[PDB]
């Protein structure tokens, strides 16, 4: 029927499968590295997208 | 060296848990259930605990 296929299109799968995964190559920017505070726990810095 | 297994062998690449007072004591086990247990490591001496 035209109103589902308009928005959702068509993707057959046989029956011998289960899922289908998606591989996802990003291109990211990101500065320096996780800088001693001489302490035990420390946060990550934020790797950013170029996009963005 | 042929006839012992302390002549050869040395681990410079273990990342072994260290210890430092007023630095990272929430990361190992509260002192007061196992005192800490002195390693060897190639040329360095310092103390290692469990991490809680």
Redesign the interface.
Known sequence: HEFAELFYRTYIVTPDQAGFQLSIRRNLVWEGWTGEGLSGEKQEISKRNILQ | GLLDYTTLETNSTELIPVI?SG?????FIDPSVLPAQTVKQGKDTFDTNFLK
Do not use: G, H, K, L
């Open positions: 430092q630095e990272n004591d929430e990361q």
